[PDB]
Amino acid sequence: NLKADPEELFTKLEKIGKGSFGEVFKGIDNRTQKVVAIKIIDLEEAEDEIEDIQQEITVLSQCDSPYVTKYYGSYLKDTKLWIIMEYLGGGSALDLLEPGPLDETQIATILREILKGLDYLHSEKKIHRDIKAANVLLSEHGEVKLADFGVAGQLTDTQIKRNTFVGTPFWMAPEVIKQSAYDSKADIWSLGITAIELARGEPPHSELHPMKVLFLIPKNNPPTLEGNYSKPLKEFVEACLNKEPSFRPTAKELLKHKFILRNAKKTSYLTELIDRYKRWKAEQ
């Protein structure tokens, strides 16, 4: 369902990011005047990532959830491919960390919405494989959605596990680094690392070279959350960061975890964080 002539339907506005894959622009849906995000990739300079792009578009085209960035479509325009998504204006969860620490209500609220996204994806037999705060985006009023499906994987009846080495090293599950047969439980490990990232501001080993953690993670005991945090938060992290994937809970099970039930509140309260970042960035 590749479409054509994107500028008949969208207005391309200013660059807002990226990067490695391509360049990302703000845009307008001319039909509704809603704002969109447009990733433009020139495919005559592709040339190996082309297979990954095809996979990314496939995954995007099959997702339909409040907890995953809304996909408008992929458009051919001469030599270039336009990947068009809803624009979320609140920043990423990583951005929201920059001015300072979160409290456990904010951490639980964000984790609960990530979990609803993971529950959705995993129920569709999809694996995100790059869960981290940078890939968790917020609307300007605090809605929280998963983004960047650039390395997302799909399980099928004939392929019940993946084994591809993808992800971001600090957040990668040990079985992914080992290139063992793995599934959605890899996302649950990454969620654990993300919980530490939300609590501490950065993942375990964050001051080491990424290549070095590739040997450390499979060997070392799993990270724990250290510091003056509630016991249920520490337990939530511990549950996620089990070396044996089958011992990790599902996303569905974690939604009922004491940490989430006791501390998560309305997403609209996250506007406080969004405002904090806006103030901070304006003074930086």
Ligand SMILES: Cc1nc(Nc2ncc(C(=O)Nc3c(C)cccc3Cl)s2)cc(N2CCN(CCO)CC2)n1
């Ligand atoms: C880089 C960036 N994106 C933003 N919102 C997005 N919504 C959806 C996105 C998305 O779907 N991208 C994407 C695409 C399009 C294809 C493949 C894969 C992916 Cl990941 S990106 C907001 C933002 N700003 C807001 C907050 N700041 C001001 C504070 O003062 C800074 C600027 N900056």
Ligand SMILES: [Cl-]
């Ligand atoms: Cl928004």
